[PDB]
Amino acid sequence: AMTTYTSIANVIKERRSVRTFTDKAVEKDLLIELLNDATWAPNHKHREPWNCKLYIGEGRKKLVDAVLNSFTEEERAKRGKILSDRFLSTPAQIVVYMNEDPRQIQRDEDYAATCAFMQNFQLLAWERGLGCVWKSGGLNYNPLFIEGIGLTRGQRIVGILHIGYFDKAPEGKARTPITEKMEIIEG
């Protein structure tokens, strides 16, 4: 019996966005376990701004219905079936949202915290062999989709995480050395 002492550096660097999943079953209790660990994200004044909708199994069709009903007839003709088939061969979706504070600093802080929570989650999931992609784009800003999944105005969708077990890790893309993006002032 050997316990492993993996540097979190390894997880951070090995994590990949995964967009295609095996038909292996993702346990709900595992996702809840991971999300609970993710809640240890920094968050100003302990506002804990993050909230979630988890769509799994038959429920995923409800999300799909909200997605499709939000498209113009042209988008829908283009991506409807494609996207429906994709969502339905993805074990879980997690819509991550927050109440939008009318004030810049508090909203930015909340959004920062909500992104830290999602990144935590992605790291936590990678560790157990779960892949995921953090989705954005115009769908998340579409008032038709937002009402369609039961959110009110002034609730912001930070991301939709698509999650499941996967066959092969996608390849990485080399990062720019931080020294090209930084000034050092030892002046």
Place this chain on the structure above:
Amino acid sequence: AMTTYTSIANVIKERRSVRTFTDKAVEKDLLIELLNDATWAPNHKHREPWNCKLYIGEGRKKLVDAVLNSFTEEERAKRGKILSDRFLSTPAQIVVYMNEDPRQIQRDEDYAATCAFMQNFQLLAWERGLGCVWKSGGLNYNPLFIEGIGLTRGQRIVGILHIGYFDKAPEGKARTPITEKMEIIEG
């Protein structure tokens, strides 16, 4: 140098925001190494929107000066000394910033990537026994501060990381079960 954690979950759960630092010196090369690990955050379209200014040693006085110059003479006289003493007993500050895309979607994605980069750095640093706090608030939105550090309009400061070795930190605050802020759509 390496790690005694048996899970990344533990690093995530045990990380604390640290505000007071010991006088132990912090390696500039170490901070750069950690920053380079942090760049493995998700970032839509491989935009890598993060940029940094690292203030270390005598360089910190430049930062302190920018801060004090953004204050009224009243603030300066009252706070100025206690502020300098604190910054100058903080081994390092990193101002993390981005260029603002005129478009909401790309901008928010870039902000979220940058927040994910910063949370990565916090966890990477905790691993090495380095504490920090992500400072936000009005200083970062003050046009006199922003100019003072050499930033232009449309360059958003996402946080200032204050970083050092430490021997005390705030007690961890109990998190709200995620079950209290989620809905499961099972059918």
